[PDB]
Design a protein around this ligand. Structure first.
Ligand SMILES: *[C@@H]1O[C@H](CO[C@@H]2O[C@@H](C)[C@@H](O)[C@@H](O)[C@@H]2O)[C@@H](O[C@@H]2O[C@H](CO)[C@@H](O)[C@H](O)[C@H]2NC(C)=O)[C@H](O)[C@H]1NC(C)=O
Ligand SMILES: *[C@@H]1O[C@H](CO)[C@@H](O[C@@H]2O[C@H](CO)[C@@H](O)[C@H](O)[C@H]2NC(C)=O)[C@H](O)[C@H]1NC(C)=O
Ligand SMILES: *[C@@H]1O[C@H](CO)[C@@H](O[C@@H]2O[C@H](CO)[C@@H](O)[C@H](O)[C@H]2NC(C)=O)[C@H](O)[C@H]1NC(C)=O
Ligand SMILES: *[C@@H]1O[C@H](CO)[C@@H](O[C@@H]2O[C@H](CO)[C@@H](O)[C@H](O)[C@H]2NC(C)=O)[C@H](O)[C@H]1NC(C)=O
Ligand SMILES: *[C@@H]1O[C@H](CO[C@@H]2O[C@@H](C)[C@@H](O)[C@@H](O)[C@@H]2O)[C@@H](O)[C@H](O)[C@H]1NC(C)=O
Ligand SMILES: [Zn+2]
Ligand SMILES: [Zn+2]
Ligand SMILES: [Zn+2]
Length: 446
């Protein structure tokens, strides 16, 4: 979403989000750090290729051809510089010149020391309470983005972790067609399509970076949850970690965990989908979680088995037509969880990543809300570890990642919605240790 210095009237009118970095000659004189060698303001590269016919409403949704309905000029940073104003470094690099390498290690959460486990829980909680220093979120669609008087931009501050909840919501929300019309929901810019793995990769990378800066700890890393144990229970749902079950309400988190204090954002879909607004920064209910508790649906009362991970890594094509939740022999669809681990599509099956979400039988199993449960972070670093192992094992073969006719948002060169600056699925389709500055301490079944 957008840097707060682009959420102004002047920026939104000009169509340009190219903020200053260190301007000594007055405003506008160091856009993108161009006085240094760090970058320049330039025209946005945005995918214009066709999408699947599932989405018939071309012209109605601000997420189409992202980010052109808000900005047509962005910062392009030179070399290994990066950031909205080119004031920081590409992933895996540090220093004033972005020339010193760093490689952080994402570890199994259960292998951390007692001091590390406590450091991670408190870091998450500080992120839930700390205002994001850079990004503000929209509360209205672009038509209304500048307010009632046309001079009051409809952006709100939001916390580091709630921003993480919001960008996921914005990517899955229904297309609003107008008051009294039923909003269109056969659309998803981050799921049920080839961009699932790369979208959630960037999502995690953005949170890890924000928390490194929040903590002033450059080597801080996001741990993962090996949910592929076949267990009856949530082995990270304990009060030194993500919270055990409350003894007073089986759907709430134990009051002896900080996460019982969290209040969720974006749970008011009936307001958003009928009035045409967007999720804002006002929190509401608490986290609901009830592992293995979906008695109406026995298939989601047990986690994926270890062999499910080994089987899905035997699927050699990243994705297969029609590049959707009913693709077969698609690695992306297998690990996302709409196929069984071998690749066989079945409308009734839910495996791996999907199975882990629904196992939680609560907030974590609802697409617009699930990042509100912080188990999301660890569920997705593990899903990303499977993806990273696939990228090594099959030499990052992007050839099946379609350039066109994928569901809207999922063309290979689409800018993943709504990340800023524009970032394509291709930029994330790389083995992480060599290219993104992190690796997983993990071993795979065989
Ligand atoms: C680049 O953008 C400018 C600014 O227009 C804004 O860009 C988007 C956020 C979109 O929502 C527009 O409504 C915004 O106005 C464009 O310049 C304006 O173009 C419009 C018509 O497209 C015109 O009515 C205004 O007078 C123009 N104002 C200015 C200051 O230029 C420009 O056309 C865009 N260039 C592209 C898309 O190539
Ligand atoms: C996967 O699902 C899609 C969407 O349901 C199927 O594609 C077509 O979808 C349109 C609407 O987008 C329907 O009107 C058609 O009936 C579908 N085409 C047909 C049946 O030829 C797609 O066929 C599905 N793929 C499967 C089941 O393998
Ligand atoms: C932030 O979102 C909440 C939830 O949609 C908005 O509050 C709702 O507003 C509608 C009508 O405006 C009321 O009918 C509901 O009672 C409100 N919900 C709650 C939980 O109070 C809120 O107005 C939004 N904030 C802004 C600035 O738009
Ligand atoms: C959590 O699981 C329970 C079942 O254990 C779900 O409650 C059932 O929901 C279905 C569909 O809405 C109903 O037909 C049943 O009557 C419900 N049973 C009970 C006992 O409530 C519940 O929807 C799940 N919630 C989440 C968020 O996953
Ligand atoms: C958002 O909040 C602004 C506060 O700006 C800064 O935000 C972080 C970095 C905190 O450290 C805080 O102390 C800082 O002052 C307000 O000025 C403003 O009301 C809000 N702006 C918008 C666009 O909503
Ligand atoms: Zn360039
Ligand atoms: Zn998701
Ligand atoms: Zn998920």
């Amino acid at each position: 979403q957008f840097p707060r210095q682009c959420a102004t009237v002047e920026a939104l009118r000009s169509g340009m989000c190219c903020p200053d970095l260190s301007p000594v000659s007055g405003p506008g004189t160091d856009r993108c750090g161009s006085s240094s060698g760090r970058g320049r303001c330039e025209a946005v590269t945005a995918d214009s290729r066709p999408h699947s016919p599932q989405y018939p409403h071309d012209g109605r949704d601000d997420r189409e051809v992202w980010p052109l309905r808000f900005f047509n000029r962005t910062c392009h940073c030179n070399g290994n510089f990066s950031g909205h104003n080119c004031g920081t470094c590409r992933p895996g690099w540090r220093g004033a010149a972005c020339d010193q390498r760093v490689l952080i290690v994402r570890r199994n959460l259960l292998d951390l020391s007692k001091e590390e486990k406590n450091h991670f829980v408190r870091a998450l909680d500080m992120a839930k309470r700390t205002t994001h220093p850079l990004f503000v979120i929209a509360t209205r669609r672009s038509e209304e983005i500048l307010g009632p008087d046309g001079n009051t931009p409809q952006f709100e501050n939001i916390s580091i972790y709630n921003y993480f909840v919001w960008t996921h919501y914005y990517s899955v929300k229904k297309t609003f067609l107008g008051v009294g019309q039923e909003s269109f929901g056969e659309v998803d810019f981050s799921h049920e399509g080839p961009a699932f793995l790369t979208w959630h990769r960037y999502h995690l990378l953005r949170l890890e970076k924000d928390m490194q800066e929040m903590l002033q700890e450059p080597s801080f890393s996001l741990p993962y949850w090996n949910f592929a144990t076949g267990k009856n229970v949530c082995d990270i749902c304990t009060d030194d970690l993500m919270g055990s079950r409350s003894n007073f309400d089986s759907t709430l988190i134990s009051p002896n965990s900080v996460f019982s204090q969290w209040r969720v954002v974006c749970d008011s879909l009936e307001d958003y989908d009928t009035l045409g607004t967007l999720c804002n920064s006002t929190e509401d209910g608490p986290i609901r979680r009830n592992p293995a508790g979906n008695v109406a649906r026995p298939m989601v009362q047990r986690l994926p088995e270890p062999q499910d991970v080994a089987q899905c890594l035997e699927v050699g094509l990243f994705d297969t037509p029609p590049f959707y939740s009913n693709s077969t022999n698609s690695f992306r669809n297998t690990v996302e969880g709409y196929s069984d681990p071998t690749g066989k599509y079945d409308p009734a099956v839910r495996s791996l990543h999907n199975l882990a979400h629904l196992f939680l039988n609560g907030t974590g199993g609802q697409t617009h809300l699930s990042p509100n449960d912080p188990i999301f972070v660890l569920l997705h670093t593990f899903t990303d570890a499977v993806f990273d192992e696939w990228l090594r094992r099959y030499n990052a073969d992007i050839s099946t990642f379609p350039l066109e006719n994928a569901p809207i948002g999922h063309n290979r060169q689409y800018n993943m919605v709504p990340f800023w600056p524009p970032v394509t699925n291709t930029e994330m389709f790389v083995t992480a240790p060599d290219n993104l500055g992190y690796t997983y301490e993990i071993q795979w079944p065989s």
